[PDB]
Amino acid sequence: SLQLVKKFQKRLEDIVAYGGTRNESSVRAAFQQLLSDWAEGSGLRLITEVTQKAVAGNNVRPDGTLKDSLQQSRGYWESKDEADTLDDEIQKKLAKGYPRDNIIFEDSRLAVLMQNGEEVQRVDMGDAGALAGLLKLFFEFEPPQVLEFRKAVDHFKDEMPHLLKILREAADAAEQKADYRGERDHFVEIAKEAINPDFSPRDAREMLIQHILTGDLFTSVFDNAQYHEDNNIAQQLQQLAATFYKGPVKRDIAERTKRYYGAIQAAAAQIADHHEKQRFLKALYENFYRAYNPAGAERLGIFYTPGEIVRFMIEATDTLLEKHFQKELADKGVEILDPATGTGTFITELIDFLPKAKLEQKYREELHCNELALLPYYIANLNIEATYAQKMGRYEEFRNIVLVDTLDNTLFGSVTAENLERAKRQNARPVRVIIGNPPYRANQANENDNNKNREYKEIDRRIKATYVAASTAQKTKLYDMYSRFLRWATDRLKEDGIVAFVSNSSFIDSRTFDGFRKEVVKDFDHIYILDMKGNANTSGERRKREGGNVFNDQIKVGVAVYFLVRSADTKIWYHAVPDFWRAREKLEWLKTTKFEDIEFDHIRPDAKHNWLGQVDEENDWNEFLPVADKDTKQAKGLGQERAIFKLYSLGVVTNRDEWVYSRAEDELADKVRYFIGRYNEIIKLPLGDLMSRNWEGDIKMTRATIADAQSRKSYSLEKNSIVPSLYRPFDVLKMYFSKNLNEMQYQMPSIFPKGVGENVVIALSGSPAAKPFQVLATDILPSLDLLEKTQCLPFYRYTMNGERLNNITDYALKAFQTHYADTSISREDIFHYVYAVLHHPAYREKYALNLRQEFPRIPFYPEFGRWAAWGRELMALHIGFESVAPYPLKRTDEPPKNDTPEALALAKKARLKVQRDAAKQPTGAVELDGLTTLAGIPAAAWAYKLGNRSALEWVLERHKETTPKDATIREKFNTYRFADHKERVIDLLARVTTVSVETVRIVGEMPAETM
Amino acid sequence: SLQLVKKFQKRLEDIVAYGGTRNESSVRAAFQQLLSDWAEGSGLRLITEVTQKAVAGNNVRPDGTLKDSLQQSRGYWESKDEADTLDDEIQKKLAKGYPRDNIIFEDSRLAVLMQNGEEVQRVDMGDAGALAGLLKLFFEFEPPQV
Amino acid sequence: SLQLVKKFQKRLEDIVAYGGTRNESSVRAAFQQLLSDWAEGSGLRLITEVTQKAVAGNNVRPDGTLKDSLQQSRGYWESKDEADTLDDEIQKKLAKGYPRDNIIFEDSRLAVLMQNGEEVQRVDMGDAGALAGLLKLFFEFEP
DNA sequence: CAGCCCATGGACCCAGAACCACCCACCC
DNA sequence: GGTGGGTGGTTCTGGGTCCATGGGCTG
DNA sequence: CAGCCCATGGACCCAGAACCACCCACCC
DNA sequence: GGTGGGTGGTTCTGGGTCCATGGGCTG
Ligand SMILES: C[S@@+](CC[C@H](N)C(=O)[O-])C[C@H]1O[C@@H](n2cnc3c(N)ncnc32)[C@H](O)[C@@H]1O
């Protein structure tokens, strides 16, 4: 520190005042003591006159050397006399071979650092600032050896499958034994009451692999072999491993795994700081699952939390412990649990935070840990004990970690009687801080994956009685593992506690989490949210604002560090991180910032318990509802009718778009044919195969199929079911509209009967509108992904054995007619007028948050006929995008590069792409393929935007050569070539170009007056 | 004095644990520190290696030279590597032309204080209480005028 | 025969262990040796990266160029990285004007032989007896 | 109660692009 | 002698989807 | 036989001794 | 500005003892 620099300057004058000596033998003693006191802080020590060898060999003698604990030099020092010039003698000493890696050439007047033969800092001495800078840089230089431990970490991160194959082969060939087969069926039984109630023989094989793999690395890379001989869990498992890992077999496997473990153990031996070796502990923790069992990596959500977030989350809880309660982390009674410990970074950084006096009492019985998987548990325990050795002194077994399912520990942890009673003492403790990082998993990829987060009966029961109870959300996503951990944390916490978790930022603002907030403010006295954004399941302008991910761009969900204190009305404090920041900036503001120095802005919850997105009320929002909650649910009793349209619908959902959304008529029939057949094969498959999904995933089986499959309800093709369907904006596709395949129809056969019917619908968007609110009047069967949250308001709702019953309810007609004193306004008139107002830009501009949360209340604007006629031109030119006469574009062809058929075929590939300028501006040119370029698109045609993508861009993206995400369709049914849809794409573009310009014209005639 | 001597010990093991050498040049950093720190509070200062003259010679060079605020030498220290037998390194030293007015002859685990013409008491450096008593006298020795 | 074929595999396995790199730059050395030896043993050679010129006038560079005594070309070898669908990189190479007479488009896992313009054979390069078959055919394809 | 509607937000990854090193043909 | 061009490797950086699955309700 | 006599080669240290490295006090 | 003494590491290298302990006499 600069304090030490000042002390050295006081010793420099003392030597030339008491001794009055100007000899090198006496003017250097000051710097000797200075480096010595700085070094003892870093972890090295300065040893004088170490005779070293030079490049020539001549024994040289740098006056000092920064020796390590493995006696390796991290640097050197050559003090010369105050008088002699340094730059000349630097170049004369260096000639004899003096070191150049990290030498501080000093002369009791000027200190220079030549690092890598390179002068970096020539700080003239006698400095109250940059001299401290110099010594910091010197004592923090990276040894050439640490950058190789980094290189070897990455290689192992990529030759892990090859190494794991060896261990996999071993465990299969051990199943030939009757000692393995007998003991691996008793492991399963003891582990069908402790960690996994569905412990499979293949889960026991996974544990065996992890135990052995980490055993070889713990004894070499980390030198701690005694860990496995002491850890209760290891012993219960060697009982199962030394059944096959013995004598010859043991030697064979070990010598076959050497061409992978070798290098890591030849660079991990030349570094001697555990904090650097922790980078491999993390790497192994994650990579193993991604190279072996990604199914586990999903539900467990194995991930590492960057140190910056952890350290912030520790200092912030310490600076809140005296604020609302009255204590300090290093007090007595601050029992800090941490469910979900993973690599242990939440208790290793706590050890480093705690002072080196009370640490003993805290390490012994106040720091607690909880884990479910084996690899994380082992890594965490070893890490904590090694951090204790680096901080306090003599290794002392951490005896507070456990292997229990936290959400189920409410005979848990019975794998070892030790961990059982360890989790019993944990349960009995009065815990006060609950810090940690929960899994944010919620739902599986596709239902052919077969991976649901274990239903925690006890824990989800209180969620149902608390978070879910208040939330009236039609869909319920409050059963997320993050919210389950929150429930467990609030119930462990007795009184005066600080739950600090980092999780998905959906809790702050989601229709689903509207009631979570309501209940959470009752169980707490102060809430301190810190939105770190970084959401990536969004597109367009939104993905820009969110920016980089505070989890090293490894996840796509939003992240928010929240601290809910309970001093036992609340005060919701909030600080959104500046938008458009990248990840490395976000994780720097989280190291260089103190919690008490951020400026939180009091949020006062609204009636709907919405924290963000607070609707403004000064606006004239309340007008004429298009559909109301009770217009769709009216019991067909004319009277409660309270809006314009009555029964509205939603975009068709299928769940098997790989076997339902195609271009050609028979192309779909073929994908569906194989299905209608393989479902019928899965049907003849046993009742057990139907009950526990023991069949094949060649075809997309969603819940409906899995169920009519259990009832053995064979299917059969009805060619009538296939119907033209507008998949995306201006993209007419085909679709098997049947009850067999499509998961939810949403009263679509009541709006568009039997796929083919004649009602004209207006597609709208939903709420909250993630993508900008959009409007598409369509006459073709729609899709849920056509517009953002597609919700279709129809015009002539049909009935069963019935007919076009006008939809605009009669109440709406009367109100409109009487208001404009017309008594002649028709249903079409209203329809068209509504479309014009919806399209009106200033309408959705004034009502921004009003529209993204409830149904767009259409205002009664001064003239009716004017807007009715506006929305008439709009309607027609958007219901007939394939008749609108084209706009004259220009095809400028060219020849292929060479004459090889290979080049010609590669020049027929859909390189469909917009041609943006050096300033991201479309030039009005679309490169169709490598032989044709269409140009002349007007710039006003790029303006019309249905979502986050212009109408023209939609057509290109919906005709690009994409590879199906299914394998059975990437091999037998991928037949779409840009060659098939060549001139049809050009034809579509020409007509859509005209449509785009026309829309802008009509929408421009509309003013800025907003009723 | 007692806590200070109990830290000279720590930084002795540290020279060998970090460096890995027992050559005199490197193991002398611990005793240097101890002496200088003790002298600071008392008022004096150990200025290391101040070439001191001799009765018979061109010049000699002690490795420690307590020099007071008025540049006057009142005590010295000559280190020793473990290899040499300290006693015979003493006669070798006090023959070339080394001072005897006040000098600490220390090896690494045993130390004598030849003070003003005669040895006082020989103490081992492993014992904190012993080295304390002796260094006190190296620092509480004052000339006759005082 | 099969001995030299097995030797190639051994060499490649040492490259991905003593260096750890599975990049072709280092892996090719193994196949370079195998092709050069079977050749000398059947009256030929494997001169490496000899720039050929295409009909369109592109100076192409195959990784190999089995040439014979009067300095004429008889075959051409081209090895792609073990980290790409081979049947995709074959097209890219041929679309620069790559020779189609007798070319071994080979990735570390599969070896495809083209002659005139048709895939004559594709073998798992791991099976010793199978490669031994394909390699012999390439060295015996006479104009 | 049991099928049948109605939600609603979801722990990354991989193609280009820039660019770099090395050597070869080809202007110089 | 440079230099642009073939071959190959190494970092960045930009940028975004259909569909699972519990509640609420007819019936 | 016990208790005197007669052999007969022995699994290394080390004290200088150069000799150099650094560097301060003295001749240049 | 050299330039040797003077302290310290460093690595060669030349050179050389008293005395155990079985067997054969041996009284
Ligand atoms: C994000 S990781 C832990 C994070 C940790 N701070 C780190 O940096 O590695 C989530 C971990 O929670 C553990 N875990 C413990 N109890 C769990 C439970 N009941 N449900 C899910 N995961 C649990 C899993 O084994 C998994 O390794």
Ligand SMILES: [Ca+2]
């Ligand atoms: Ca020096």
Ligand SMILES: [Ca+2]
């Ligand atoms: Ca000395």
Ligand SMILES: [Ca+2]
């Ligand atoms: Ca190649």
